[PDB]
Structure 1
């Protein structure tokens, strides 16, 4: 694994044993924008700064943003054992272990134009039956870099892929190249 992986899995475990999965997801989504905006991240980093000055502001952020009492405990421990310089990685990693625990898959639909959502629900149902997702969190982006249609990227990160926008001209140029 990794430090981010092992810490995010511990957070998801302590947030699943006492069910706050929606609450801890909202809390980590608030914490991702808190620990973005790089001055405050530098401040909780920058080990020259006193730990007490870190912890004062950390408790005040707990108060102002209404965080959960176990996610606040998690960031207190990230301050205690100096893994706070990886907190961006830990928060970016928490979403994957959260999707593993909630059995959700998340798969991008890079298309050209928007959809009427019926074929999108069809694609979501297909990608949830082929992967065993009890509730796939299908997503999409509007990208003009594509040519014609759509493609799905599911699995771990984007590990699997079926594509019908540009694959046909790719195989046509490969076939006429005959090399």
Structure 2
């Protein structure tokens, strides 16, 4: 068999297998950026009410699905990789879970260019000065080449403090867990 080039991040499931196949196809020929473009364009195309309703009916012959998808991939002059991918999905019958596929690819592309995702949780909004110093400190966690991809969020449950997720690392500065730890210590 061929030596498919391993994508940076590994995904699993049918979505992950299709995404890995597409990533290794595009990586050879160095067509990642454009391929992502056509993928995020079929993302909009497939949401079209007519196509969305037509592709979920199981009572239209599969060949009809493939013919319609070839029609809708020739009009946009999609790269041969994306047209082949969509024909493949229609043949195998997995296009019902295309959004999981393309989404996975997006993830598999972020990890390529270093967008190590993060996530900050707090009980209130954050002042842009405080948020900016936060970003500046969080940047110190990464390596060279990587760039932070922050994502603010709000939860009321945690009283104060803060919660930070940096890829896999996780620091719970929240006051909820501090209170719980103190309560356990002063019970046990």
The normalised TM-score by structure 1 is: 0.73
- What residue number does 1:163 align with? 172
1:37 & 1:20 partners in 2: Cα distance?
26
Task: Show the 5 A alignment for 1:54-133.
Answer: 54-62=65-73, 67-111=78-122, 112-116=124-128, 117-129=131-143
**Aligned 8 A contact 2:117 2:149 in 1:** yes
Compare CA radii of gyration and give the structure with the larger one: 2
Task: Show the 5 A alignment for 1:5-24.
Answer: 5-24=16-35
2:45 & 2:102 partners in 1: Cα distance?
11
Task: Tell which deviates more after alignment, 118-127 or 29-38.
Answer: 29-38
1:76 & 1:65 partners in 2: Cα distance?
15
Q: Count the aligned residue pairs.
A: 173
Q: CA deviation at 1:14?
A: 2.2
- What residue number does 2:3 align with? none
Q: CA deviation at 1:125?
A: 0.8
1:67 & 1:124 partners in 2: Cα distance?
39
Change (3 A) 1:119 1:20: farther
Change (3 A) 1:70 1:174: same
Change (3 A) 1:91 1:163: same
Q: CA deviation at 1:119?
A: 2.1
1:81 & 1:126 partners in 2: Cα distance?
45
Query: Any unmatched runs of 5+ in structure 1?
Result: none
Change (3 A) 1:176 1:122: same
Query: Any unmatched runs of 5+ in structure 2?
Result: 1-11
- What residue number does 2:7 align with? none
String of CA shifts for 1:66-102, please: whole Å, max 9, x gaps.
7544223211211122222332332332233223333
The normalised TM-score by structure 2 is: 0.71
1:124 & 1:28 partners in 2: Cα distance?
31
**Aligned 8 A contact 1:8 1:94 in 2:** yes
